[PDB]
Design an enzyme around this catalytic site. Structure first.
Site, PDB file in Angstrom:
ATOM      1  N   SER A 212       0.795  -1.218   0.000  1.00  0.00           N
ATOM      2  CA  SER A 212       0.000   0.000   0.000  1.00  0.00           C
ATOM      3  C   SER A 212       0.830   1.272   0.000  1.00  0.00           C
ATOM      4  CB  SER A 212      -0.935   0.022   1.195  1.00  0.00           C
ATOM      5  OG  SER A 212      -2.186  -0.513   0.841  1.00  0.00           O
TER       6      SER A 212
ATOM      7  N   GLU B  98      -5.515  -3.442  -6.804  1.00  0.00           N
ATOM      8  CA  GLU B  98      -5.781  -4.169  -5.567  1.00  0.00           C
ATOM      9  C   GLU B  98      -6.807  -5.284  -5.795  1.00  0.00           C
ATOM     10  OE1 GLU B  98      -4.275  -3.896  -2.718  1.00  0.00           O
ATOM     11  OE2 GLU B  98      -4.112  -1.808  -2.015  1.00  0.00           O
TER      12      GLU B  98
HETATM   13  C1  LIG Z   1      -4.557  -8.515  -0.626  1.00  0.00           C
HETATM   14  O1  LIG Z   1      -4.534  -7.593   0.455  1.00  0.00           O
HETATM   15  N1  LIG Z   1      -3.887  -7.960   1.455  1.00  0.00           N
HETATM   16  C2  LIG Z   1      -3.403  -7.157   2.287  1.00  0.00           C
HETATM   17  C3  LIG Z   1      -3.565  -5.717   2.072  1.00  0.00           C
HETATM   18  O2  LIG Z   1      -4.595  -5.244   1.625  1.00  0.00           O
HETATM   19  N2  LIG Z   1      -2.565  -4.936   2.396  1.00  0.00           N
HETATM   20  C4  LIG Z   1      -2.760  -3.518   2.627  1.00  0.00           C
HETATM   21  C5  LIG Z   1      -1.700  -2.759   3.304  1.00  0.00           C
HETATM   22  O3  LIG Z   1      -0.546  -2.495   3.042  1.00  0.00           O
HETATM   23  N3  LIG Z   1      -2.573  -2.506   4.251  1.00  0.00           N
HETATM   24  C6  LIG Z   1      -2.356  -2.001   5.444  1.00  0.00           C
HETATM   25  C7  LIG Z   1      -1.255  -1.058   5.509  1.00  0.00           C
HETATM   26  O4  LIG Z   1      -1.393   0.062   4.990  1.00  0.00           O
HETATM   27  O5  LIG Z   1      -0.190  -1.421   6.034  1.00  0.00           O
HETATM   28  C8  LIG Z   1      -3.088  -2.414   6.495  1.00  0.00           C
HETATM   29  C9  LIG Z   1      -2.607  -2.122   7.891  1.00  0.00           C
HETATM   30  S1  LIG Z   1      -2.631  -3.612   8.839  1.00  0.00           S
HETATM   31  C10 LIG Z   1      -3.965  -3.587   9.888  1.00  0.00           C
HETATM   32  N4  LIG Z   1      -4.291  -2.451  10.536  1.00  0.00           N
HETATM   33  C11 LIG Z   1      -5.352  -2.418  11.374  1.00  0.00           C
HETATM   34  O6  LIG Z   1      -5.634  -1.350  11.961  1.00  0.00           O
HETATM   35  C12 LIG Z   1      -6.119  -3.555  11.593  1.00  0.00           C
HETATM   36  O7  LIG Z   1      -7.098  -3.510  12.372  1.00  0.00           O
HETATM   37  N5  LIG Z   1      -5.822  -4.702  10.966  1.00  0.00           N
HETATM   38  N6  LIG Z   1      -4.734  -4.749  10.091  1.00  0.00           N
HETATM   39  C13 LIG Z   1      -4.385  -5.993   9.395  1.00  0.00           C
HETATM   40  C14 LIG Z   1      -4.408  -3.165   6.331  1.00  0.00           C
HETATM   41  S2  LIG Z   1      -4.441  -4.134   4.855  1.00  0.00           S
HETATM   42  C15 LIG Z   1      -3.800  -3.030   3.646  1.00  0.00           C
HETATM   43  C16 LIG Z   1      -2.627  -7.729   3.418  1.00  0.00           C
HETATM   44  C17 LIG Z   1      -2.406  -7.108   4.669  1.00  0.00           C
HETATM   45  S3  LIG Z   1      -1.431  -8.195   5.616  1.00  0.00           S
HETATM   46  C18 LIG Z   1      -1.375  -9.354   4.348  1.00  0.00           C
HETATM   47  N7  LIG Z   1      -0.732 -10.538   4.422  1.00  0.00           N
HETATM   48  N8  LIG Z   1      -2.052  -8.967   3.261  1.00  0.00           N
END
Ligand SMILES: CO/N=C(\C(=O)N[C@@H]1C(=O)N2C(C(=O)O)=C(CSc3nc(=O)c(=O)[nH]n3C)CS[C@H]12)c1csc(N)n1
Length: 265
Positions: free
Chosen positions: A42, A140
């Site tokens: 992201s 995405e």
């Molecule tokens: C196919 O999509 N998969 C994703 C994804 O969408 N990545 C994006 C990314 O860089 N994102 C970020 C952010 O900006 O860091 C995040 C931050 S992580 C997070 N923050 C929270 O406050 C919460 O409650 N839960 N989580 C998990 C969410 S996903 C999106 C993903 C996330 S972990 C993983 N193995 N895949």
């Protein structure tokens, strides 16, 4: 000694870590795997919002963009609330940076280059800043799932951090647009446990996060000493040894950030 501290991190977290800090007048470049390719995840939403700001007048950021619920094919905490309603371009901007909203980014890709041209348009915006290295190649969610080793949807800590040095510190955006991009990433909701945890509280921190498959955990940030001298910090990691569903280590990034904080005292 920075290199040693970094490889210990790598050892203790079982991860690949790339760090790049651009050189200032006072300090040298802090680089570690800086030129290896890491997934955008992201973090592409930050220079994307800048590309949307740059191509269009601020009059554009009040154009209601319409979309469906079947357009929410990724994490989308804000675009959730406007299933049909739709949002201003300025609203999606706000959603893709601070909340990392995925549907947000896709409509901004669309706004930037048509339905099948936005990722290349986003990449061309990067080239216009002298990044001949990073590429976006999917929307995405699939931009988070490219296998390890693949060059698709990759940047490098050195190239994104130079892109970020331009956007916030250089003249890639005009004062106003530049100013809106800096408030947006300084409000980011996603970067507490990353670089922000690594820097002393009297240091300013503005960031955008990336997290994805294969343990990918990223944080690009512009940081300000109490003297107000500015630094750019990219931290990119993955734990690809553990498969697609391996667990990202956020503390890794904070840990990386405390070390760069340490030579920047
Ligand atoms: C196919 O999509 N998969 C994703 C994804 O969408 N990545 C994006 C990314 O860089 N994102 C970020 C952010 O900006 O860091 C995040 C931050 S992580 C997070 N923050 C929270 O406050 C919460 O409650 N839960 N989580 C998990 C969410 S996903 C999106 C993903 C996330 S972990 C993983 N193995 N895949």
């Amino acid at each position: 000694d920075l290199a040693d501290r970094f490889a210990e991190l790598e050892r203790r977290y079982d991860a690949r870590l790339g760090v790049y800090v651009p050189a200032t007048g006072t300090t040298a470049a802090i680089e570690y795997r800086a030129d290896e390719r890491f997934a955008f995840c992201s973090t592409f939403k930050a220079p994307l919002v800048a590309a949307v700001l740059h191509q269009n007048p601020l009059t554009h950021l009040d154009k209601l963009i319409t979309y469906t619920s079947d357009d929410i094919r990724s994490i989308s905490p804000v675009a959730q609330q406007h299933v049909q309603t739709g949002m201003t371009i300025g609203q999606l901007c706000d959603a893709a940076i601070r909340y990392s909203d995925g549907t947000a980014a896709n409509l901004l890709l669309a706004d930037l280059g048509g339905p099948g041209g936005g990722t290349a348009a986003f990449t061309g915006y990067l080239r216009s800043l002298g990044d001949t290295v990073s590429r976006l190649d999917a929307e995405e969610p699939e931009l988070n799932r490219d296998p390890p080793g693949d060059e698709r949807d990759t940047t490098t800590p050195h190239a994104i951090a130079l892109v970020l040095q331009q956007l916030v510190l250089g003249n890639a955006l005009p004062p106003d647009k530049r100013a809106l991009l800096t408030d947006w990433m300084a409000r980011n909701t996603t970067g507490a446990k990353r670089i922000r945890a690594g820097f002393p509280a009297d240091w300013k921190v503005i960031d955008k996060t990336g997290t994805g498959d294969y343990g990918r955990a990223n944080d690009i940030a512009v940081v300000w000493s109490p003297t107000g001298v500015p630094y750019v910090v990219a931290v990119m990691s993955d734990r690809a040894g553990g498969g697609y569903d391996a667990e990202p280590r956020e503390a890794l990034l904070a840990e990386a950030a405390t070390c760069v904080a340490g030579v920047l005292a």
